[PDB]
Write a protein that binds this ligand. Structure first.
Ligand SMILES: OC[C@@H](O)[C@@H](O)[C@@H](O)CO
Ligand SMILES: OC[C@@H](O)[C@@H](O)[C@@H](O)CO
Ligand SMILES: OC[C@@H](O)[C@@H](O)[C@@H](O)CO
Ligand SMILES: OC[C@@H](O)[C@@H](O)[C@@H](O)CO
Ligand SMILES: [Mn+2]
Ligand SMILES: [Mn+2]
Ligand SMILES: [Mn+2]
Lengths: 498, 498, 498
C-alpha cells in the first residue's frame, strides 16, 4: 500500500444522446474494454475508474460535481469517442477544480478500408470529436493536458501515467503540513517568503512550534525505546570506533536516537509531513538534529535547514511524486566547486542533513564529530557517497508576486579520491551544459542555495509539475544558451506578471 | 535631545546665469533672510540648512550627490527663486535618493504696483520658474511635494513642517530594527507576510531571536536592580492590595520587573527599536510580558502581539513620527462592541499590552491576575482609561503584491459606566462615519484586527506617509460612502498593481 | 593618460560572522592576494580597489553609500567568499546607483579531496553564498551581471574586463555634452527625438548654439595659427596638386583649417565631447565643415550630420568605449549598393565626414572639390579606403516611448576596383547574413540611415551596453532569420513597453 492506492483517476467518455441506445452501448463496451485493459496491463500509477457516459449537459455537470467532492478523485482523463458538443461541458468544466487530460485515442488503429461505412463513421469519430472539445478548453484558457495515440500504445501509456502522477501529487500537496521548529536564519532572504501565498497557491500549510514544545517530547522518551533504536543503528550502519560501545562518543549516539524518537513522535502525533530546524534556536536540545533528520527524510519526510519551509515542502512533494520509481530524492546544498578544464564539478552537501535514499553504499558510516555551528554537542550523522547517474536539482523561489521553479539537469559522478577528513555525506556532479553557464543562469534567475536533488524524477516530470500549478519553469540544461535564456526570463516576466 | 536633532532639511535655491551676478547676489540675500527667519520663528520639526545656489548642472548634481551621502540630510526643500531650466536638474534628480518638496514661494507678499519693472520681473519669477521645475518632476514621475504660499505664511509653515516630519520618519525607518521573540501565532494570516518585501520597500528589518536567548538575559538580572525598579513602580502607579509588600501577588510583580529589565537590556544591547512576543512560545519565562511591554512602549519602543511585526514596526514609526506633538500612540485591538441606536461604541484593548501614553489618569493601576491564554503565571499589568478626543486607528497590511494602509478616523469617548471586572486597560470610541459602515469598509479592505491607535497623529499625516512610501491609503471617515469606497478600491488596484 | 585612469572598480568581499574572526582573517588574505594578482597580471581596463569586508548590514550600506559618492567609482564587483545573508545587502542595494557584477569565483581551483574538512567548507562556500546573493538581485529585479570561473582563469578575466569597460562607459556618458550647431534637417524623422528623455535615460545632454556663435570664434582665429595647422596637414596627408601652395584650391584649404581651429576652440572652451552640424544652416561660414570634422572625430570627438545628436552621442560613447582596443570607430551612412550574385556589397560614406581612424592608408588624400548640398565654397576633405575585417554598424533610435539599439554584424572588404571619381572616403562591406535579409531586418526594425561603424567593438560589447542601460538590442547577423526576428520584435515590444 502506497499513497497512490488512496487515489483514482476517472475515465470519462464523451458522446451525445442523439445517437442510439444501442450506438452508446457500443461506445460503453469499448470504454469498459479499454479501461479494463489499461488497469490490468498499462501499469499506471493508480487505478482508472470508468464513469457513466457523458451524453447530456446535466450528466456531465453531475460527473464534474461528483469529481470535486470525491477526495480520492485526483483527476479526469476524457475520451471523446463520438462528437460531444462542447457547450454540454461548459457548466461542468466551469466548476471543475480537478485536473483534466484528453486522451485523444481511437478504437481500432488500422483503418478498415474495405468495410468502413457511415455506421462506423457515426460511432468512431474521436478525430473531430476531440478537436471540438480542445476548443472549449483553449477558449476557457483551462490547463487541459492532451495525449494522442492508440490506446494500446505503450508510449502513450507512459505519458498518461506521467500525468496521473502529477494529478496525485497536486491532491496530496493540498493536505501537506509543514512543522517549523523555530524561525528562519537571521538576515537570510531566499528562505523567507509569504506562507499565506504558498497555501493559497499550492495548498500546503506552514506553522511554527516552539523548540521547547519539541524538547518536552524528546525528554519524555523512554530509555528502553532509545536503546532499541540504537540496536537498529548498529544493524543498519557501519559504526566507527568512537560510536561503538565503550566509544568516547557513545553517549552522543544515544542522545541522537533520543532526538530522533522525540521528533518522530511529535511529527506523527501532529500529522506532519515535513519539517524544518534552525541552528540559531536549539535551546533544550543536546545537539543539532542530524542523524534523526536523515532517517526521517529516508522514511519519506520533507526537510530543509535553517527554517527553509519552501524546500522542505518541495522535498516532501517530490519524494511523494517519486513513489514506485527507481532512485533517491534529498535535501541538498551547493557546498564547493572543483575547477578543471573539461571536468568542472560541484560538491553538494549540508552541515549534517543529507538523505541516505541517494546513497550508493549499502551501509553508510555513522559518526560523531565536532560541529561549531549552533554551539552544541558533537552530533551524530550518516556519512556516505551519492549514486551515479542522471539527476535534477530543483529550487522553488518566491519572487514576491509569483513563484519560479528552477530546474538544472545534472549528472552525478564518482568521487575520484576518498574524502577521509570530510565528516559529512557528499553528492558530486557535472552541471549541464557546463559549470559557468549553469551557475550563471541559476544566479541570473535567482535560484536558492537550497535545492531538492533527485535521481528518481526528471525534467519532464517538473515541466508537468510547473504546468499543473501554473508557475514559470526555468530550465537549465545541455540546450541552454544565455542570450535565449535571458530573453525567456523577460518574456515570461510579462506573461506571468498578470 | 530628540531624534529630530539628528537630522536636517536642505534649503536649496534654484536659479540660472541669464541676468547675474548681482541678481544672484540679491537671490542669495533673500534666501539667507528667509532661511534664518524660518529657523528662528517658524518652529519646524528640524533645522533648515541653506546650501549654495543651484545655477549650473554640475552644481545641482553636486548638491544631490552630497544630499545622498549625508546621513543627517532628510530631504530637500527647493525654492525656484528665478527661472532655473529643468534639464540642469535631471542628472541630479535621477540620482537623488532623498525626498523633495517645492516651496512655491515669493520674497515679497504684495506686488509693488507703482515700482514693478523688468529688473524686479527678472529677479522674482517663481511664478514660472516653479512650473518649469514642476514639469520635470511630473515628467520623471517623481514624488515631488509642493506647497504654495508666502514664506511668512504660518499656514504654509505648518504644511512645510508637516512634510519635514515625514522626511525625518522615512530616514529613521531605514534604520528601524524589529526583534521577534518567537514566530507568528499559528494559523493566523494578517500578521504574516514577506519580511524581505518590507525591508526592500520601507527599509526596516525583521529577524527572530529564540525566546531562550531572552530568558538567559532575564535570568542574569541582579536582585538589586529588580528591587530598584519595583520602587519606581510604587512611586509611579496606584498599587492594588494584592500587589503591595505582603500581597499574595507581590512575587508576580518582582518577576514582571525582572522580565522588563531583561527585555530592556536585550533590546538596548541589540540596538532594537521594536519587538514582538508570542503567547504560544514562552518557554523559560514565568509569565507573558505585560507590564514590561507597556512601559517599554511608553519609553518609545514599537510592539505588537503574537509576532505581528508589521504593526510593531508601524507603532515605532508613528511614535517617532509624533515627536513633539501632544501625545498618545499605542498598540490596539478591537475587543468588543456596544450596539445602541445613536451610540454605537467600540471597546479597544489587548490581553495585556496597552500603552499608558494614551492614559488619562496620571496614575494607572498596577494589578496582577489570571491569564489563561499562554498558560503561565498571573502577569502584572497597568489598568487605565483612555483620553478623550479625535484619534486615528491605522493598519498596514500586506496584499501579497503590495502594501495597503488603512486609516479610520475615530473619536474616543468617556466610558458611561465603570468596568470593575475588566483586568485590562481600555479605549472606547465612536468609529466614523458610523459603526456598521466603518467596520464594513474596514473588513472589505482587509484591515487587520491589530492597529496603531493615536491621538497625536491625524489623517493628513498618514496621507503624506502613504505618498512618501508610494502605497495605497484607504480612508474611512465621515465622508465615506460604500459605493464610492468600493470604486476607489478597484481603481487603485489596477494603478498600484502596475 | 586615458579616461580609464580617472575611474576604478571596487572589489567588495561578501561574508558574515558565523565562524570568524580567523576565518575572516583568511578571507581577507585571499581577497588581497586575488585583487593584487588581478591588478598586476589580468590587464583589466582600470584598477580594482579592494574594500573592507562586508559582514554586517551597516558595513554593506556604508560601502554602497561611499560607492555612490565617489565619482571615480564606476561599479562594484562582488565576491561572496562565504555565505553572506542577502537581507544585509538590501538597504545598500536599494540606494546603490552604480552597476554591480558578481564574480562567482573560488580561491582554490582544484578541490583538495584528501584534506577537505568542515573548516574548508565553512571558509570556501561561494558555491551557495553566491546563490543567496543572486536571489536578492533577481528578487529586486536589479541588473546584476554574473561571471563564473576561477580567479586565475584568463577567459573569466576577459569577461570581467569587458564588463568593467561598460561600467566606465556608463559613468562617462553621464557627463557627455553634445553641442548642436543648428537644428535637424527639415522634414527628417529618425534624427529627431526627445532630448529630455535621452538625458533622463543616458545622462548625456544636448543643447543648441547658434551657427553665429561659432562663426564669431572661427573669425577670431589668428593667421599664424591657421598657417601652423596647414603645415601639419602637409606633413600628415598626401596633398593633391589643387591643394598645394600655388594650387587653385589652396585658399579653400586655409579656410578649412580656420574652421577646424574655431570649432576646436569652441568645443574645448565649452567642455563639449560631441557635436553636430546642419548644411541647411551655414550662415557666416565659408564652407560645410569637412576636413575639420574628420580630424576632430579622429581626436575622439563624437559627430553626426544634419543635427543628428543621437548618433553623435553614440559615436563618442563607442569611441570612449573602445579605448585601448585595436581601433577604428566612425560616423557612417549607407550610400549605395552593389548587387551581384554571391557578392552583394554595401558602399558606406558621407557627403564629407568620415573618420580616418578606420583608414588603411597611412596617408589619406586631402582634396578639395565641389559640393552642391549647402550651397557653399568647395570644402576640403580627407579621401581614403577603409581597413579590412569584422566590424559592426550600430544605430540608436527613439521609438517615442523607448530606445532601440540596432546592431548589424558586417565584414569590410577591399574594393575590387578603384573609385577615381568619388571625392569622398569609402567603406565597403558584406552585411551578415546577406544583403537582402540584413537590409530588410534593419528596415523592419526602423534603424536609421546614420550609424556608428566600428572595427574595435563587437556584438558582445553592444549586448552588454544594452543590458547596462536596460534597452532592447536588435541583433542582425549570420544567425538571423526573419520569422524568428519578427517574433522577438513583438515579444520585446510588450516587455519593454511595460
Ligand atoms: O532664462 C529666463 C527665461 O528666458 C525667462 O524667464 C523666460 O520668460 C521664461 O520663459
Ligand atoms: O487565539 C485568540 C487570539 O490569540 C486572541 O483573541 C488575540 O487577542 C487576537 O489578537
Ligand atoms: O551562515 C552560514 C550558513 O548557516 C551555512 O553556510 C548554511 O549551510 C547555508 O545554508
Ligand atoms: O537631402 C538629402 C540628405 O541631406 C543627404 O542624402 C544626407 O546624406 C542623408 O543623411
Ligand atoms: Mn543550508
Ligand atoms: Mn492580539
Ligand atoms: Mn547624413
Amino acid at each position: 500500500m502506497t499513497i497512490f492506492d488512496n487515489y483514482e483517476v476517472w475515465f470519462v467518455i464523451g458522446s451525445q444522446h442523439l445517437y442510439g441506445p444501442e450506438t452508446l452501448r457500443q461506445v460503453t463496451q469499448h470504454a469498459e474494454h479499454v479501461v479494463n485493459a489499461l488497469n490490468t496491463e498499462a501499469k499506471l500509477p493508480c487505478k482508472l475508474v470508468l464513469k457513466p457516459l457523458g451524453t447530456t449537459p446535466d450528466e456531465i455537470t453531475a460527473i464534474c460535481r461528483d469529481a470535486n467532492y470525491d477526495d480520492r478523485c485526483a483527476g479526469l482523463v476524457v475520451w471523446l469517442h463520438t462528437f460531444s458538443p462542447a457547450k454540454m461541458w461548459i457548466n461542468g468544466l466551469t466548476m471543475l477544480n480537478k485536473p483534466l487530460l484528453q486522451f485523444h485515442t481511437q478504437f481500432n488503429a488500422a483503418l478498415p478500408w474495405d468495410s468502413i461505412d457511415m455506421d462506423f463513421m457515426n460511432l468512431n469519430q474521436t478525430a473531430h470529436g476531440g478537436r471540438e472539445f480542445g476548443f472549449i478548453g483553449a477558449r476557457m484558457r483551462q490547463q487541459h493536458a492532451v495525449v494522442t495515440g492508440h490506446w494500446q500504445d505503450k508510449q502513450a501509456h507512459e505519458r498518461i501515467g506521467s500525468w496521473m502522477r502529477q494529478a496525485v501529487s497536486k491532491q496530496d500537496t493540498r493536505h501537506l503540513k509543514v512543522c517549523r521548529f523555530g524561525d528562519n536564519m537571521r538576515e537570510v532572504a531566499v528562505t523567507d517568503g509569504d506562507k499565506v501565498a504558498a497555501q493559497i497557491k499550492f495548498g500546503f500549510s506552514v506553522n511554527t512550534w516552539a523548540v521547547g514544545d519539541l524538547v518536552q517530547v524528546v525528554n519524555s522518551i523512554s530509555d528502553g525505546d532509545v536503546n532499541a533504536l540504537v540496536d537498529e543503528y548498529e544493524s543498519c550502519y557501519t559504526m566507527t570506533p568512537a560510536t561503538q560501545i565503550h566509544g568516547e562518543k557513545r553517549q552522543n549516539v544515544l542522545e541522537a536516537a533520543r532526538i530522533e524518537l522525540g521528533m518522530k513522535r511529535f511529527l506523527e502525533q501532529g500529522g506532519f509531513h515535513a519539517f524544518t530546524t534552525t541552528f540559531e534556536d536549539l535551546h533544550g536540545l543536546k545537539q543539532l538534529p542530524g542523524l534523526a533528520v536523515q532517517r526521517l527524510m529516508q522514511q519519506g519526510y520533507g526537510f530543509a535547514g535553517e527554517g527553509d519551509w519552501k524546500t522542505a515542502a518541495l522535498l516532501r512533494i517530490m519524494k511523494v511524486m517519486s513513489t514506485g520509481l527507481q532512485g533517491g530524492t534529498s535535501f541538498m546544498e551547493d557546498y564547493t566547486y572543483h575547477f578543471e578544464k573539461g571536468n568542472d564539478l560541484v560538491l553538494g552537501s549540508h552541515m549534517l542533513e543529507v538523505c541516505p535514499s541517494i546513497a550508493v553504499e549499502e551501509k553508510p558510516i555513522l559518526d560523531v564529530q565536532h560541529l561549531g555551528i549552533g554551539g552544541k554537542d558533537d552530533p551524530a550523522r550518516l556519512i556516505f557517497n551519492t549514486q551515479t547517474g542522471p539527476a535534477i536539482v530543483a529550487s522553488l523561489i518566491d519572487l514576491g508576486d509569483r513563484y519560479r521553479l528552477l530546474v538544472n539537469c545534472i549528472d552525478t559522478v564518482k568521487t575520484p579520491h576518498s574524502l577521509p577528513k570530510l565528516p559529512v555525506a557528499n553528492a558530486l556532479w557535472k552541471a549541464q551544459p557546463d559549470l559557468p553557464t549553469a551557475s550563471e543562469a541559476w544566479i541570473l534567475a535567482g535560484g536558492a542555495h537550497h535545492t531538492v536533488f533527485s535521481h528518481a524524477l526528471n525534467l519532464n516530470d517538473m515541466r508537468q509539475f510547473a504546468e499543473m500549478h501554473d508557475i514559470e519553469i526555468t530550465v537549465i540544461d545541455n540546450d541552454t544558451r544565455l542570450p535565449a535564456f535571458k530573453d525567456a526570463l523577460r518574456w515570461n516576466e510579462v506573461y506571468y506578471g498578470f
